[PDB]
């Protein structure tokens, strides 16, 4: 529209913008950009802000002002220079005018910003960079025109001035974008405590908020140490859960009010929607910028094949420069694509986190407010699952909410992008891509079914091994290791792995299908383009088509996922909306009033003709009817009735729970409350006493003495610091009641509503306590007390007792008055300071280099000669696909050289037989991974692990808890089973694809080897940082995400008390703090992903520039064809995504190969003695009779503990029915364990009939020694096994044993199955005592010369005891026995009783002598017990 050699050309004949477009739009929009936004910011920063916190005029502003004055002088001087020659030009002179007019405002911002702002302004960065971009484009223009036409577009002075306007504007932009530091001024500090610094997202110039460079200070720390939970950064400005919850609550309340038919979905959209349109806009920009990368590739190939065709042999010879400016546009497009995609991810994940912390914290307030009946409809599981999972859906719908349209938008501008390029014959490709979706659904469904079956089989295996880990003592005692370990091998090696090779086969099939369809689209649409009525198929119609098909593949495999998530979230929103409309406590129930009433002990609260109800559903009338009663201040008033007839109902009414129909209901002062079933929160008992109150020590001792729990305080091993575990695992009913009452009294409330706490406390303690706290002489004498009881003494102590019935008041009067009224229910029955409160946020071991030896152990366990084949076929499956593309390149070049397609069939066939090779190689490599590599390791790790756990010294089982030693058989085997096998594939198939991409690019342009080295260094840098910090920032996400629900269900358990103490605020703030403590660790967790992805995608787009400018140099050297720049650059476009998987899967390896370390930790545990040596007498015990002969015997439980036995030398006689007894804490209980070598013999030995047992081995010894463990153990299974693993005895033998054990009938009792009746622990089992008879049957079935009888320390049925004694004295008549009976009665009738004390054999054989020898120690305990 203005005079110039070329008009308003966006792109000149060369590759640049024309001089009438550079300063006509690019350098004119920036100026109006300021005159619209920067002036607004100038107003805003100088309209309400006025301070001097920002430090003095440092040299940074001293330089920015100078480099703006020079810049404005240069703009004016360039206008002056152009005013002389080439003067009359509207666009240029107008651009100069608007330019200095806007640069003055830029100077103004530079002045105001440095005081009234700490964040570098956004406008004065984006404008002030657009200035540099426009001036740089103009300089490039006046260089291109000079080099290609001799003339200068400006006159060799405008050149110098524009070069300066570039060289200063860029320098001053870098000066503005890299400020020194904030708050340098003499101010000392804002937060003196400085517990957690404010996160750097605030105080981060827009460049840092775009390049995510504000985390590069956390990462470094996270790389050089583990990240303790107090090493993170607090939430940004507007992430506090209070703000979000209150915003959403206000909006949703307006929703319930105005919109007649409300909906929570609109309440969420109307609130957190303005941050979603921005994400949608960024997604649209990224989608547009993603489908102009192929267009630029197509343009570059067309340019190359035109330039070469021209140089073979003058109307405007093609300029080489255009090549570079299509090799640079491909970099700008990629860079802006990453910088806009990651802004979309940030602005969508933030809206995700604005619902996981504004609905998580808004469910809790409802739960405190909702009425009782709706609480009881679904008690605890569903309500906590309503935000453990039913909100994680709403926090994941956001990630796939823009793909409702951005899926049907990457498709339209891809189908159209292909139709303009590849003609009408693209449809036969998209039809394949569609009709493969049902196959993907089919395969994923079958894979899910196989995963379910495999998980069920794993549960079966883990229960079978849980039984062993539970009764390992019995297992080692009976020598049942092998014949009941092969019972686990028969599950793993036969039923479980057979459901893993099939899973491997189907994973191989789906991997093959995921590697052929990407190639079966391009080949099958070329096969139609060539043959149908068409034209040449040249290089610029194939290599763009490959990229377009690849970009089309993704938006089609996310259509099922998005709709699945959408339907799931619709269900979840239905659940939430039916939650948020229940009846909520109807707060007009009780009119609470302060306790300023009086000092003369007036009636606190009144019920006049009151008719309360649980809720307006049935029982809504007779819940509580016609109430008229007082409660007196400072007088213990009590109500008594039968169960639920008005006892708990009235108290629950006085708390405001129940609703009233008519009549006044008041309550004076703060109220304490003890629920009928007292509840204990999860924390230290001191916290329970305090219960969120200011700590007054002296009163704490006064209470702990008062409630008679100081004795229990001594009982607890930790005392006031004792952690009261989940639902009071460390407490029982009586201490629970006393603890609840202690909490109540320490609350020091002005009205005590005691709902029958006495029912679980000791009666002596009860009458001890009635006067300490309740009675007139108690500390709570001067406070009013309503009480529910059934005990009698309190009624006499009470003052104004009320007798009720069926939720109705019978009478109200004093004990003497009513007793004088001949009332059968009663007459015939026989000023302080309440505590304060305070609240706030609740809330080294340096890293080490990766463990490489574990990978080598996994390889050696993974058949190393067969893991080379896996990598070999990975290499082959990639090399064949690369050669398929090379053949595509050659065939396309042959098509382009000719007019038409010369030999369609031959080229097309040899191309097809080069993709099928790749897919087939992928199939075979995945099969070798599963069938040969993984399953041959999962069958060698677990085999070795279980073979070395079942042979660990019993001390090992004693020390470590069962909870973890079983975890390694549950998860650390499953993760090795079917979670680490594929994790090496996706990392090895992507550590080769990148290698071959680099190799094919370096083969086209060898100089590229100098770009990939400095890029690989930064790559490993960023990868190591992201690994070592994302592992932490994910662990810290997992740790702090459980206590949110572990606290919600805790609140749901005791809800009438938290509401009862009227401190609903404190628990709500506890929830808000527990939510912010999760967001504070989840924010860095995902912004770490953004940081890494930005770094890699930037690295992924320096290669595109590097492989397209080092390519055009080759072209200018005249050795480049169109194919050589189509192939290499079509791979270069793909390296971005495969540069993330190779990192993501490197994270997934690290969090999985820790499992193999845990396995190998156990697989080499120090074992016990060798099983079998030459000590092999035939009857499994050397003679048919056995007399154990000790000598010098002494040993210890553990190497550090004291000696259990001290130099014992005792000669037991054959078939001598001795009985070993001793008072507790003697070491007698571990004389069996030292007979079966379960604890090794330190000194001496145990010669059993002329042969010892030290040099014999366990398995041969432990055959013929029968024990009856103190805790009788039965395995999950059938009687046929629980009595014999060998089945070497006739079923008649088992039946005669059960008859002589008097338990043949009780097998058929529960189940008529015969012998294979079901047994387990939990469910199908015998009685709590019959297991003793069962173990007796086990002992008697083996014909045993020695039975080391042990008795349960707990109670037992004496009839079972005499049954056992009779059968062992009738079947073991001539047979040795060592009865270790704690109760002296069981062994006082034995043959030669012998007493042990502190590992010393004390007395001699004859028992009567021990009764009649200086009142011996045995006789001393005999008198003490009461048997003599």
Query: Approximately what portion of the residues adopt beta-strand conformation?
Result: 5-15%
- Distance between the ends: 125 Å
Number of strands: 24
Major sheet: order of its strands? 7-10-11-4-12-13
CATH topology term of the domain at 591-828: Rossmann fold
Indicate the percent of residues in helices: 55-70%
Structural class by helix and strand composition: alpha/beta
Q: Given the C-alpha coordinates, what overall shape results?
A: globular
Could you please describe the fold and organization of this structure?
It is built from 57 helices and 24 strands. The chain has a domain at 591-828: Rossmann fold (3-Layer(aba) Sandwich). The termini are far apart. Helix 23 (501-531) packs across helix 24. It has 1428 residues and is an alpha/beta fold. It is globular, with a radius of gyration of 42 Å. The modification Phosphoserine is found at residues 240, 841. Residues 43-62, 110-119, 180-267, 345-400, 446-508, 572-859, 940-982, 1026-1096, 1143-1428 are cytoplasmic. It is a multi-pass membrane protein. Its EC number is 7.2.2.2, 7.6.2.3. ATP 2 binds at residues 1222-1229.
């Amino acid at each position: 529209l203005c005079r110039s050699p070329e008009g308003f050309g966006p792109i000149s004949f060369y590759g640049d913008f024309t001089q009438c477009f550079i300063d006509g739009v690019i350098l004119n929009l920036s100026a109006i950009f300021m005159i619209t936004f920067g002036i607004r910011d100038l107003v805003n920063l100088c309209k309400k802000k006025h301070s001097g916190i920002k430090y003095r005029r440092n040299w940074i502003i001293v330089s920015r002002m100078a480099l703006v004055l020079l810049e404005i002088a240069f703009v004016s001087l360039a206008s002056l220079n152009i005013s002389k020659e080439e003067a009359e030009n509207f666009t240029i002179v107008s651009q100069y005018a608007s330019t200095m007019l806007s640069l003055f405002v830029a100077l103004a911002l530079h002045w105001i910003e440095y005081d009234r702002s700490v964040v570098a302004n956004t406008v004065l960065l984006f404008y002030w960079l657009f200035e540099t971009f426009g001036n740089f484009a103009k300089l490039i223009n006046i260089l291109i025109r000079h080099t290609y036409e001799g003339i200068w577009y400006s006159g060799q002075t405008g050149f110098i001035l524009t070069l300066f306007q570039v060289i200063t504007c860029a320098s001053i932009l870098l000066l503005e974008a890299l400020p020194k530091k904030p708050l340098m001024p003499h101010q000392h500090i804002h937060q003196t405590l400085t517990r957690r610094k404010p996160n750097p997202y605030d105080s981060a110039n827009i460049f840092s908020r775009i390049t995510f460079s504000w985390m590069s200070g956390l990462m470094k720390t996270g790389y050089e140490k583990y990240l303790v939970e107090a090493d993170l950064y607090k939430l940004p400005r507007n992430f506090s859960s209070e703000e979000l919850s209150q915003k959403l609550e206000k909006n949703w309340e307006n929703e319930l009010k105005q919109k007649s038919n409300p909906s929570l979905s609109w309440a969420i959209c109307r609130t957190f929607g303005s941050k979603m349109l921005l994400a949608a806009f960024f997604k649209a920009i990224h989608d547009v910028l993603a489908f102009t990368q192929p267009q630029l590739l197509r343009i570059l190939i067309k340019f190359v094949t035109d330039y070469n065709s021209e140089r073979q042999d003058h109307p405007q010879k093609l300029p080489i420069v255009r090549g570079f400016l299509i090799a640079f546009a491909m970099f700008l497009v990629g860079f802006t694509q990453t910088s806009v995609l990651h802004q979309y991810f940030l602005n969508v994940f933030n809206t995700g986190m604005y619902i996981k912390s504004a609905l998580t914290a808004l469910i809790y307030q409802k739960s405190l407010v909702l009425s009782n009946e709706a609480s009881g409809l679904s008690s605890t599981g569903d309500i906590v699952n309503l935000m453990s999972v039913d909100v994680q859906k709403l926090q994941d719908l956001t990630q796939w909410l823009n793909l409702i349209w951005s899926g049907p938008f990457q498709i339209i501008i891809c189908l159209y992008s292909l139709y303009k390029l590849l003609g009408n014959s693209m449809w036969v490709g998209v039809i394949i891509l569609v009709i493969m979706m049902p196959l993907n659904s089919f395969l994923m469904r079958i894979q899910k079914k196989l995963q379910k079956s495999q998980m069920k089989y794993k549960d079966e295996r883990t229960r079978v091994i849980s039984e062993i880990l539970n009764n390992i003592k019995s297992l080692k005692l009976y020598a049942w290791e092998k014949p009941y370990r092969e019972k686990l091998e028969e599950v793993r090696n036969n039923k479980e792995l057979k459901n893993l090779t099939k899973l491997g086969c189907y994973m191989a099939v789906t991997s093959f299908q995921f590697n052929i369809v990407p190639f079966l689209v391009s080949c099958c649409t070329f096969a139609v383009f060539v043959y149908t009525e068409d034209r040449a198929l040249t290089t610029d119609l194939v290599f763009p088509a490959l990229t377009l098909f690849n970009l089309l593949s993704f938006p089609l495999m996310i259509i099922p996922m998005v709709l699945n998530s959408f339907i799931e979230a619709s269900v979840s929103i239905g659940r939430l909306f039916t939650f948020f409309t229940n009846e909520e406590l109807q707060p007009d129930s009780v009119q609470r009033l302060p306790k300023v009433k009086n000092i003369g002990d007036v009636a606190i609260n009144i019920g006049d003709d009151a008719t309360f109800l649980w809720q307006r559903k049935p029982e809504y009338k007779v819940a509580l009817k016609n109430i008229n009663f007082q409660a007196k201040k400072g007088n213990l008033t009590c109500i008594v009735g039968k169960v639920g007839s008005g006892k708990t109902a009235l108290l629950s009414c006085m708390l405001g729970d129940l609703f009233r129909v008519k009549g006044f209901a008041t309550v004076h002062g703060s109220v304490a409350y003890v629920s009928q079933v007292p509840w204990i929160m999860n924390g230290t008992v001191k916290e329970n006493i305090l219960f969120g109150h200011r700590y007054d020590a002296e009163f704490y001792e006064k209470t702990i003495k008062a409630c008679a729990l100081t004795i229990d305080l001594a009982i607890l091993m930790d005392g006031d610091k004792t952690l009261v575990g989940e639902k009071g695992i460390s407490l029982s009913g009586g201490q629970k009641a006393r603890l609840s009452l202690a909490r109540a009294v320490y609350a020091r409330a002005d009205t005590y509503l005691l709902d029958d706490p006495l029912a679980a406390v000791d009666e002596h303690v009860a009458r001890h306590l009635i006067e300490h706290v309740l009675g007139p002489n108690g500390l709570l004498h001067t406070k009013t007390k309503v009480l529910a009881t059934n005990k009698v003494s309190a009624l006499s102590i009470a003052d104004s007792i009320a007798l009720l019935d069926n939720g109705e008041i019978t009478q109200q009067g004093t004990y003497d008055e009513i007793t004088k009224d001949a009332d059968s229910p009663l007459w015939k029955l026989l000023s302080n300071e309440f505590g304060d409160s305070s609240e706030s946020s609740v809330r080294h071991r340096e890293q080490g280099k990766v463990k490489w030896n574990i990978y080598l152990e996994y390889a050696k366990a993974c058949n190393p000669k067969s893991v080379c084949v896996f990598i070999l076929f990975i290499v082959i499956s990639m090399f064949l696909s690369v050669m398929g593309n090379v053949w595509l390149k050659h065939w396309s070049e042959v098509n382009s050289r000719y007019g038409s397609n010369p030999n369609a069939a031959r080229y097309l066939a040899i191309y097809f037989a080069l993709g099928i090779g790749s897919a087939l190689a992928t199939l075979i490599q995945t099969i070798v991974l599963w069938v040969f590599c993984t399953i041959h390791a999962s069958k060698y790790l677990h085999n070795l692990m279980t073979n070395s756990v079942l042979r660990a010294p019993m001390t090992f089982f004693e020390t470590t808890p069962i909870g973890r030693i079983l975890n390694r058989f549950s998860n650390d085997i499953y993760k090795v089973d079917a979670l680490l096998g594929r994790t090496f594939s996706q990392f090895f198939v992507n550590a080769v694809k990148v290698t071959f991409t680099i190799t094919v690019i370096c083969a086209t342009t060898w100089q590229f080897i100098f770009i990939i080295i400095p890029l690989s260094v930064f790559y490993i840098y960023y990868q190591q940082y992201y690994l070592r910090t994302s592992r932490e920032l994910r662990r810290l996400d997992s740790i702090t995400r459980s206590p949110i629900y572990s606290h919600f269900q805790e609140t749901l358990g005791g809800l009438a008390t938290v509401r009862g103490y009227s401190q609903q605020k404190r628990f709500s703030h506890i929830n808000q703090c527990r939510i912010d403590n999760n967001m504070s660790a989840f924010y860095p967790s995902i912004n770490a992903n953004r940081w890494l992805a930005y770094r890699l995608e930037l690295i992924g787009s320096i290669i595109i520039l590097g492989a397209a400018t080092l390519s055009v140099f080759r072209l200018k050297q005249g050795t480049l064809t169109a194919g050589m720049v189509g192939l290499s650059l079509s791979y270069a476009l793909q390296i971005t995504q495969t540069l993330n998987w190779i990192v993501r899967m490197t994270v997934e390896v690290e969090t999985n190969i820790v499992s193999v370390e845990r396995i190998k930790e156990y697989a080499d545990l120090k074992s016990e003695a060798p099983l079998i040596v030459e000590g092999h007498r035939p009857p499994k015990e050397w003679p048919s009779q056995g007399d154990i002969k000790f000598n010098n015997y002494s040993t210890r439980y553990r190497p550090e503990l004291d000696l259990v036995l001290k130099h014992i030398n005792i000669h037991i006689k054959p078939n001598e029915k001795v009985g070993i007894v001793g008072r507790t804490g003697a070491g007698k209980s571990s004389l069996t364990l030292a007979l079966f070598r379960m604890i090794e013999a330190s000194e001496g030995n145990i010669v059993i009939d002329n042969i010892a047992i030290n040099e014999i081995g366990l398995y041969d010894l432990r055959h013929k020694l029968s024990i009856i463990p103190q805790d009788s153990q039965v395995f999950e299974g059938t009687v046929r096994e629980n009595i014999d693993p060998i089945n070497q005895y006739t079923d008649e033998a088992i039946w005669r044993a059960l008859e002589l054990s008097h338990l043949k009938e009780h097998v058929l009792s529960m189940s008529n199955d015969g012998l294979d009746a079901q047994l387990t622990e939990g469910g199908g089992n015998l009685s709590v005592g019959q297991r003793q008879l069962l173990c007796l049957a086990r002992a008697m079935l083996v014909p045993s010369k020695i039975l080391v009888l042990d008795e349960a320390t707990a109670a037992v049925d004496v009839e079972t005891d005499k049954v056992v004694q009779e059968t062992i004295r009738t079947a073991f008549k001539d047979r040795t026995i060592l009865t270790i009976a704690h109760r002296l009665n069981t062994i006082m009738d034995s043959d030669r009783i012998i007493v042990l004390d502190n590992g010393k054999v004390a007395e001699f054989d004859s028992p009567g002598q021990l009764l009649s020898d200086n009142k011996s120690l045995f006789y001393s305990l005999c008198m003490e017990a009461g048997l003599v």
